[PDB]
Amino acid sequence: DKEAAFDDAVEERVINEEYKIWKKNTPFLYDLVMTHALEWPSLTAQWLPDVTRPEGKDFSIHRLVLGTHTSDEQNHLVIASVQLPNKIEIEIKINHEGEVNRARYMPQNPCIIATKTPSSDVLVFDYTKHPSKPDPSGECNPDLRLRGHQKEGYGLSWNPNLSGHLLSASDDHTICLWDISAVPKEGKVVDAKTIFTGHTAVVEDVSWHLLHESLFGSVADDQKLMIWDTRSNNTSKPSHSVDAHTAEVNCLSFNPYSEFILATGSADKTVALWDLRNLKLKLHSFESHKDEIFQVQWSPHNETILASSGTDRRLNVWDLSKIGEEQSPEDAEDGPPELLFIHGGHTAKISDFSWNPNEPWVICSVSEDNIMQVWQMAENIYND
């Protein structure tokens, strides 16, 4: 009624007050905080692995794969440059049909970037083969088009041990696999090598294991986590299937230092911790988030550190080494002991984030309002 609008107004106040108190506390909570309004909101964020370090400078140049979300206008695949100590610029804009749901670089050659669109084709771009400045026609000339899905989705994951092997999750209940290793010179469209059909609802994410080249995991709106092996001759049924959450599962992340461990994040407002050797039993539930979680990512530097983000506008950082520690009921009120940090700088749903791989503790998070933040919590919070 006019009650819906009283609620909206109260809620604006709430967000605004929260952002005021956050802003006053920044000098105590961060070693670094940069905020940039992008031209459009980005649904995706990934640091590229390279870092250039010009002579005589007190800063290094890092890079970010980003995207746009615009209804009416021309969308772009984007690469931005960030300066960090020992400011922000766009460097390439590539025409993209529709918004960029996810964009991810191939480890074995990070010029190569795969995207997910609102259409069913999964696109591959080589950004060294497009002009810095996009043709005004607005035509999307991707280097490959990968076929197999019937709908859009998010999950996208390159195999870091088998060059060119890409996995994708879709709203069509399907995971697709491609091998773009070796692609005939007259060939631009590539068909799926395998399609996995074990889910019975929207498949939200997929990821390759980091050491075992055949292994990968998936999560879906059927509330299941599925562990799959590509060596198997049955693609309708995973090696393992667990009932992970009490609502949709949106994300997963394998721990890069602990080969049996992974985390999942869900609309049930939790992150779950898992051990592949025994999937019946969830190891742990990380609770603190107030609404649906969309992204989960392990720290690339510390085996016990994990972070998650989503709809409640927060990005939480966790440390599993503190699970079980006792606490005064005063500390207990703020959250459990494994919650290290609540990033409170965004005033909209967080869509994606990425841990910087060359600068420990630096994270890039992006929200629906068009804000990009590059930040780093204060050292004394994770050390002594």
Binding site: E18, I21, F28, N380
Partner: peptide, 12 residues
Amino acid sequence: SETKRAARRPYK
């Protein structure tokens, strides 16, 4: 120290 606490209370 209570620098920990502030970290878990960004909105206070």
